[PDB]
Amino acid sequence: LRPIATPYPVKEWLQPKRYKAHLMGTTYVYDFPELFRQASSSQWKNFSADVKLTDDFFISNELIEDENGELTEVEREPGANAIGMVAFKITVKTPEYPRGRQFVVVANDITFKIGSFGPQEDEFFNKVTEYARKRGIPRIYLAANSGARIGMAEEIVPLFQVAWNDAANPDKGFQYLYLTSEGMETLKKFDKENSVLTERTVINGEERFVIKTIIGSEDGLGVECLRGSGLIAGATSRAYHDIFTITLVTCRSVGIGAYLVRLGQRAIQVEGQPIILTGAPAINKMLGREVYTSNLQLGGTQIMYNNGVSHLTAVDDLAGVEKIVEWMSYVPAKRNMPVPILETKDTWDRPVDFTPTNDETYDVRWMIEGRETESGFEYGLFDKGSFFETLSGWAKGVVVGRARLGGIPLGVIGVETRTVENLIPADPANPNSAETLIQEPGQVWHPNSAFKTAQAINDFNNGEQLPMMILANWRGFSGGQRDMFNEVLKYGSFIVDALVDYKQPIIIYIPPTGELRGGSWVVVDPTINADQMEMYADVNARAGVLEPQGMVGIKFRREKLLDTMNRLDDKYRELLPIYGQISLQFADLHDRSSRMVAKGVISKELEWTEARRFFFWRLRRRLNEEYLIKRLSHQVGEASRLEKIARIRSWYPASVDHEDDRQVATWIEENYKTLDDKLKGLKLESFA
Template identity: 20%
Template sequence: MIQEIKPIRDRILKGGAQKYHDKNAETKKFFARKRIELLCDKGSFVEDGLYANCLDSELPADGVVTGLGKIQGRAIALMANDSTVKAGSWGARTVEKIVRIQEVAEKLQIPLFYLVDSAGARLTDQVEMFPGRRGAGRIFRNQARFSGVIPQICLLFGPSAAGGAYIPAFCDVLLMVEGNASMYLGSPRMAEAVIGEKVTLEDMGGAKIHCSTSGCGDFLCATEEEAIEKAKCYLSFLPQNYRACLPSVAGSDPERPVTDLKSLIPQSDARAYDMKQVIKTLVDKGSFFEIKELYAKEVITGFARLDGKTIAIVANQPLVKGGVLFVDSSDKAARFIQIANCYSIPILFIADVPGFMIGSKVEKEGMIRSGAKLIYAMSNADVPKISLIVRKAYGAGLYAMCGPAFDCDATIALPSAKIAVMGPEPAINAVYYNKMAELDPEAKKAFMAEKIKEYEANVDIFKLAGELIVDQMVDFHEVRTELIQRFGFYAQKHQDKDRRPGILPM
């Protein structure tokens, strides 16, 4: 007798029991298959392993949907936990399906999406799913090995607990839905039992905490639709894999006219201003796509388009903490530079930086360790790099923002640019400390004024251009055109794809 496929398939496609669907609906969570429908082009999804555990009516697809689809015509692979089946927990077949779709994505060299909503390991299956060669550890191993080879994008719609929390951690980018997404190694209940801490889930591992404080999350999204749209937008800047060409679109004029740039830079060196407005005068209208917007805001990281072509931007933000580089902002910039480098995205550094933060607080936090990571990542990025010096580039800040010594393809200075080991006052204090201690206040002031004048003449930006330290000086309204032309030429730059990675400092 030949059995009918349809009744079994229909049962599996419905997922878990109705009460779990209802529960999801109450918290504005979509069914896993609905999420796939929203993510992929209509009718493009082809599924693998639909019949995993099909003889057990309690385990449709074993709680995970895997397969291939298209996003705006581009092939992608995906896995989506089904939280209506045993809370999306991982059984033996679940893990095998995830490992297989990872292998498929690697074989086809296409981006891989992880739609995560899972309670973690299914304890009843632990021997089959946890310790072995193709156990859950293999998922993380694959993620780590495919890192920088194919884009890996995680959308977190629900919990991602204990070991499961490492799926988002190993992705290039993490989008989290506020109120539903959470990541933690031990639940609040466990924290209370083991260490005595009383804390809510939202406070310990909620989306907001991870996107603003821990730095684990990149995008805080109000709804699942928003997370899915943002994930598609993210993909639109990236190639299919590390060897593929970058996508490009038709170019457009910037949101703010290029002539606005001059008025955005304050006369006083100490005054704050909003670097995001500067970016709006440079890149194609509406193209700036900020990553980790809520985290370590003194540095801005994001993709944008310049005449239709993808670039990565690392910019100091004088509006927050004076634009000084801290521990978290250094880590944030370092990681973003690595993403850009892996996918051959040219990097524009926009510098206005007083330097790395000093003081006992940051030294204890490992300022040197994180600062070194940033300089390491930037040095090892061999994509086209342009450093635009808007105002200050002081001390190691110049180095971090891709100064001339770091194979910068061009250091471009605006007339407001200043490059020095440090600002005039601290420099003069350091050099003439003993002499100034002997002077009375009046004489000290006059001495300082005179020395500041000398100091500024010595590091005058035209003098530095004369010494060939900066490659080009441009007027404010000329920057955009200069960048478009130069990135056009530098696209030819040779990248050594076979170079072995070094050791991340400290």
């Protein structure tokens, strides 16, 4: 029976599966929508304390297969699921979508056959994924599983005979397994003749049916589970390019489960819940020794968070759900809808306060989100409280997250200026290899941080469909033996490929005290994707092929130095020190934003304190023009980007200055319908 005198019903007794989930250290699958209700109520409170929510602000409807295999909504008692995979359609009013947004949640039921994936779970997971893709809606996956289902044909276990070499002495081997005439009958009786493929023989007067293959009557034993897993692996690969995908790992995720985490890309790992290919015991078998003590050694957050497989960790399920909900607050309600604007108290119209200084170490997050000080808050570039960092466990040379600029959500990449101390632990499989410490100097792309940069760019583009700002401040790629060996060329090239593919406005901005040198400029140059990319440089930024020291070593050598002493020391070599300094200054004078403007390689030089104002209206004006470019592209007879943007601009009143971001933005927003009428009349002119 139950725990006896509680004021309200014992949930874990009414539905013992709920208690089974709790014993495995996870939330019961039918209790997840309530976690999402809690997390969404909280985001309302964080946004506007006085807002009054009805219960119909949050709706969760279970999705199941109908009689024709099609997904429909039902309301049923928890634990009625006849398969180990479950889904809900969620309709929720949020700050960014006060009239409602929708997404699907799919989840393993760790209580149903240990949350294993059989062909039915695979087909359902694939239908849910397709259901989301068709509607353009996000797909959240809650991973709590033991991977592919495995089995043998249990009905053949008590039936099979051995054909011994010597009936007297078994120990000397056997020739095959077979069924008797009675075995074949038990199978016919139970309508399971298919379970084996046999070949009739006769030895010593009576019939043997040699087992050539065991098939089994139960679905879900072997290769049919492999097929089902490939199906959902490919389904998820495609989903990532199509809709917002994210996964929360909540008890463990095994095999196909672990790949699904990676294939959906965006992953949050609850502390102590491993992401693994196989368990430690199974691996230890093979290896012949007790090499590993736990699954957490193979797939704990100290592996996957440190890897970049897990974008975030969470202390518990609810924290994980809060993170999902916060991550989606930057993301359009569905594919191709505009990005969700959310103005808060920190409005566009203010200077930027926190400012880095040449001789003084800073955390780049201060420039991004601002900084708390003894004398008050110093505001950064982006809206106060809006910075949501991800991939924070991995390749800490770069910092990536979401933020809002006067309400406009965007992806943000910045450069960590402090040296990173990367601790690689020993693998207990190498009798004694040791812990190794990697030093990663600031403002240098290593293979890991190059990969992270490309990954961020892809993750902003693909489901999030965000504009992006990169606060570019790299002194170059590392060219030393180890990093070259570890394929820095490949990871650096991933960045160019990610930019080519980018579909929303991009701003590259070299910040004050910052620099962009050589290859590190190249990889981010706006001619990579001129349709989307624009570059800016602070008046206190630097750029050129080399730093002054490197430049002097090639083009201001001792000959040229002495010639220059010869030219303005009347006496003319304890002059070297100061004369070197002079050559260094001579080089630095080429590296200024004024030269960048003169050569036409940046859109504008800017002042940091005015950047927030400038970028807000530049972005807002770009979002508006992009929108019109796309409307124009949906006509019948199509053209270049140059032709489209020129024609849209020809619709602006003659007096409007095409260069005035605010003016252009304000006039478009006053005139959307009028521009729409103009588009309608062009379609009625595109049969020819």
